[PDB]
Motif scaffolding. Structure first.
Motif, short mmCIF file in Angstrom:
data_model
loop_
_atom_site.label_atom_id
_atom_site.label_comp_id
_atom_site.label_asym_id
_atom_site.label_seq_id
_atom_site.Cartn_x
_atom_site.Cartn_y
_atom_site.Cartn_z
N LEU A 118 0.80 -1.22 0.00
CA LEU A 118 0.00 0.00 0.00
C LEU A 118 0.83 1.27 0.00
CD1 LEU A 118 -2.98 -0.86 2.37
CD2 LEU A 118 -2.80 -0.99 -0.14
N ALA A 119 2.15 1.13 -0.05
CA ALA A 119 3.01 2.31 -0.06
C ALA A 119 2.87 3.11 -1.35
CB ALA A 119 4.46 1.91 0.14
N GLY A 120 2.89 4.43 -1.21
CA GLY A 120 2.77 5.31 -2.36
C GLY A 120 4.12 5.78 -2.87
N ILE A 121 4.11 6.85 -3.67
CA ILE A 121 5.34 7.37 -4.26
C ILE A 121 6.45 7.81 -3.31
CG2 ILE A 121 6.35 9.04 -5.80
CD1 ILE A 121 3.61 9.24 -7.18
N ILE A 122 6.14 8.66 -2.34
CA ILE A 122 7.17 9.17 -1.43
C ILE A 122 8.09 8.15 -0.75
CG2 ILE A 122 7.58 10.49 0.66
CD1 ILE A 122 5.23 12.28 -0.18
N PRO A 123 7.53 7.14 -0.09
CA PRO A 123 8.39 6.15 0.56
C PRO A 123 9.09 5.17 -0.36
CG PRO A 123 6.17 5.45 0.75
CD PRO A 123 6.12 6.87 0.21
N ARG A 124 8.43 4.76 -1.44
CA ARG A 124 9.04 3.81 -2.38
C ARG A 124 10.24 4.45 -3.03
NH1 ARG A 124 5.88 -0.49 -4.24
NH2 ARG A 124 3.71 -0.47 -3.47
N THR A 125 10.13 5.75 -3.22
CA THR A 125 11.16 6.55 -3.85
C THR A 125 12.38 6.71 -2.96
OG1 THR A 125 9.44 7.77 -5.05
CG2 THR A 125 11.63 8.76 -4.95
N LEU A 126 12.16 6.93 -1.67
CA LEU A 126 13.24 7.11 -0.71
C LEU A 126 13.95 5.79 -0.49
CD1 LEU A 126 13.27 9.95 -0.14
CD2 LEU A 126 11.38 9.56 1.43
N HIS A 127 13.23 4.71 -0.70
CA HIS A 127 13.75 3.36 -0.51
C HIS A 127 14.61 2.97 -1.70
CE1 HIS A 127 13.55 -1.10 -0.80
NE2 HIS A 127 13.59 -1.06 0.52
N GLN A 128 14.18 3.36 -2.89
CA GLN A 128 14.94 3.03 -4.08
C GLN A 128 16.20 3.86 -4.16
OE1 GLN A 128 13.32 0.08 -4.29
NE2 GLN A 128 14.54 0.34 -6.17
N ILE A 129 16.09 5.15 -3.84
CA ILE A 129 17.25 6.02 -3.90
C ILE A 129 18.46 5.34 -3.28
CG2 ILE A 129 18.25 8.20 -3.17
CD1 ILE A 129 15.37 9.36 -3.14
N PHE A 130 18.29 4.78 -2.08
CA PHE A 130 19.38 4.10 -1.36
C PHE A 130 19.67 2.76 -2.00
CE2 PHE A 130 17.81 6.95 1.93
CZ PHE A 130 18.98 7.42 2.46
N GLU A 131 18.63 2.17 -2.57
CA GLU A 131 18.74 0.86 -3.19
C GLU A 131 19.51 0.89 -4.50
OE1 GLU A 131 17.55 -1.25 -1.20
OE2 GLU A 131 17.89 -3.12 -2.30
N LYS A 132 19.46 2.02 -5.19
CA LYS A 132 20.14 2.16 -6.48
C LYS A 132 21.51 2.81 -6.38
CE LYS A 132 16.56 3.84 -9.25
NZ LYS A 132 15.76 3.80 -10.51
N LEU A 133 21.70 3.69 -5.41
CA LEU A 133 22.98 4.37 -5.23
C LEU A 133 23.97 3.60 -4.36
CD1 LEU A 133 22.34 6.65 -6.99
CD2 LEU A 133 22.58 8.22 -5.06
N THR A 134 23.48 2.90 -3.35
CA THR A 134 24.36 2.13 -2.49
C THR A 134 24.92 1.00 -3.34
OG1 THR A 134 22.99 2.59 -0.56
CG2 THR A 134 24.56 0.78 -0.40
N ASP A 135 24.06 0.51 -4.23
CA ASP A 135 24.38 -0.57 -5.18
C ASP A 135 25.67 -0.24 -5.92
OD1 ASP A 135 24.37 -1.67 -8.04
OD2 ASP A 135 22.69 -2.81 -7.21
N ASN A 136 25.57 0.63 -6.93
CA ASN A 136 26.72 1.04 -7.72
C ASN A 136 27.76 1.75 -6.86
OD1 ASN A 136 25.99 3.97 -7.58
ND2 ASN A 136 24.24 3.29 -8.83
N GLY A 137 28.74 2.37 -7.51
CA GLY A 137 29.77 3.07 -6.78
C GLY A 137 29.56 4.57 -6.77
N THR A 138 28.64 5.04 -5.93
CA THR A 138 28.36 6.46 -5.84
C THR A 138 28.36 6.97 -4.41
OG1 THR A 138 26.91 6.27 -7.78
CG2 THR A 138 26.78 8.32 -6.49
#
Ligand SMILES: Nc1ncnc2c1ncn2[C@@H]1O[C@H](COP(=O)(O)OP(=O)(O)O)[C@@H](O)[C@H]1O
Ligand SMILES: CC1=C(C(=O)c2ccccc2)[C@@H](c2cccc(O)c2)NC(=S)N1C
Ligand SMILES: [Cl-]
Ligand SMILES: [K+]
Ligand SMILES: [Mg+2]
Length: 334
Positions: A118-138
């Motif tokens: 049931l999560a909307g845009i705001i939290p899914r977005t904050l979760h991915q940000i870390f999920e995509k940047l921690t992933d690669n080398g940034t």
């Protein structure tokens, strides 16, 4: 190089009150043809219908994940590349503006906030940000602020050291011309994904304490949730790329017909589509703050929410007509 404002429409499904009463829908969606058809009156036996074509259409069966995978992930990537993107939600109260932007929690603690469907845009977005940047080398740092407008007064809903009675003030950045400076608004640094929730929740709380003070606060207030990303990407070959991306997630006050910002937004949108020289940005806080999101250098999307009930026919059509006029607004990001 420019880009039109992309508009999507999202119908909400019927609630139990409507279903137990065998509610019949005056709305139909064809995601494939990207159309929404509305029974403007009469019977399903024989009737008249009004149709509109938008950039995208999501019917009642659409789940949060669908919205995120279709409209949000692609806009988040633009943000990570170093651009400015703004997403909105527009529609009569009760159609899903808040569901869409923030979403809710599944009952009986069935889930953690990271997996709640049931999560909307705001939290899914904050979760991915870390999920995509921690992933690669940034190397990155993320920042969030939640600014809200009520009867032209600004409220900071994430400063746990202040109360909300306190309005903040607005000024123009003598630096940028399409910008303003909001004195005192706090910027909370989210050090990691496991800090995201309490920060949101705190804003949830401050908010319920805002609802006690101001009449119909949740319906007549405009909410601007901003996340700012500072990245220092180092490629595998070893190049340094310093980017700065900002995303604004705006939950507008219900369109149902006092609200100076709502009225202005509509007038600003009118001027832009009618190619009128003067655009009344300054006639309201909301439009001055988000000036660059309307004919500015920011990538803008408007998600228009509607109801399927025949009781809301009139408001459903105003929303579509409004969202359909927005499509013609031109924006130039880089
Ligand atoms: N897409 C949807 N899927 C499931 N429920 C929805 C959807 N959209 C709205 N609702 C429900 O409709 C009610 C209206 O919610 P809300 O998001 O608060 O509307 P608004 O912000 O436009 O006033 C809520 O109880 C919510 O759970
Ligand atoms: C706090 C909060 C949300 C927000 O995004 C938010 C609300 C007010 C201000 C700022 C942000 C969102 C949410 C958050 C996480 C998981 C989830 O599944 C739903 N919806 C609910 S019910 N909560 C608990
Ligand atoms: Cl999910
Ligand atoms: K839906
Ligand atoms: Mg709401």
């Amino acid at each position: 190089k420019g880009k039109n404002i992309q508009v999507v429409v999202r119908c909400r499904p019927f609630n139990l009150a409507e279903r137990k009463a065998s509610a019949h829908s005056i709305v139909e969606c064809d995601p494939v043809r990207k159309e929404v058809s509305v029974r403007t009156g009469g019977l399903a036996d024989k009737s008249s219908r009004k149709t509109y074509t938008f950039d995208m259409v999501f019917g009642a069966s659409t789940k949060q994940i669908d919205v995120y995978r279709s409209v949000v992930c692609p806009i988040l990537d633009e943000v990570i590349m170093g651009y400015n993107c703004t997403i909105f939600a527009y529609g009569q109260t009760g159609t899903g503006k808040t569901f869409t932007m923030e979403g809710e929690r599944s009952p009986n603690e069935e889930y953690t906030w990271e997996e709640d469907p049931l999560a909307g845009i705001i939290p899914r977005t904050l979760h991915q940000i870390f999920e995509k940047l921690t992933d690669n080398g940034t190397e990155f740092s993320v920042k969030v602020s939640l600014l809200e407008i009520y009867n032209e007064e600004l409220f900071d809903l994430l400063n746990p050291s202040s109360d909300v009675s306190e309005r903040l003030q607005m000024f123009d950045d003598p630096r940028n011309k399409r910008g303003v400076i909001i004195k005192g608004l706090e910027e909370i640094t989210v050090h990691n994904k496991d800090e995201v929730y309490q920060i949101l929740e705190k804003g949830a709380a401050k908010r319920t304490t805002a609802a006690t003070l101001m009449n119909a606060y949740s319906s007549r207030s405009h909410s601007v949730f901003s996340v700012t990303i500072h990245m220092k990407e180092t490629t595998i070959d070893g190049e340094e790329l310093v980017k700065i991306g900002k995303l604004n997630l705006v939950d507008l006050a219900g369109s149902e017909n006092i609200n100076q910002s709502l009225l202005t937004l509509g007038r600003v949108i009118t001027a832009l589509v009618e190619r009128t020289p003067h655009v009344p940005y300054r006639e309201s806080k909301l439009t001055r703050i988000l000036q660059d999101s309307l004919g500015g250098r920011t990538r803008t999307s408007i998600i228009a929410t509607i109801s399927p009930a025949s009781l809301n026919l009139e408001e459903t059509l105003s929303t579509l007509e409004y969202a359909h006029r927005a499509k013609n607004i031109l924006n130039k990001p880089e």
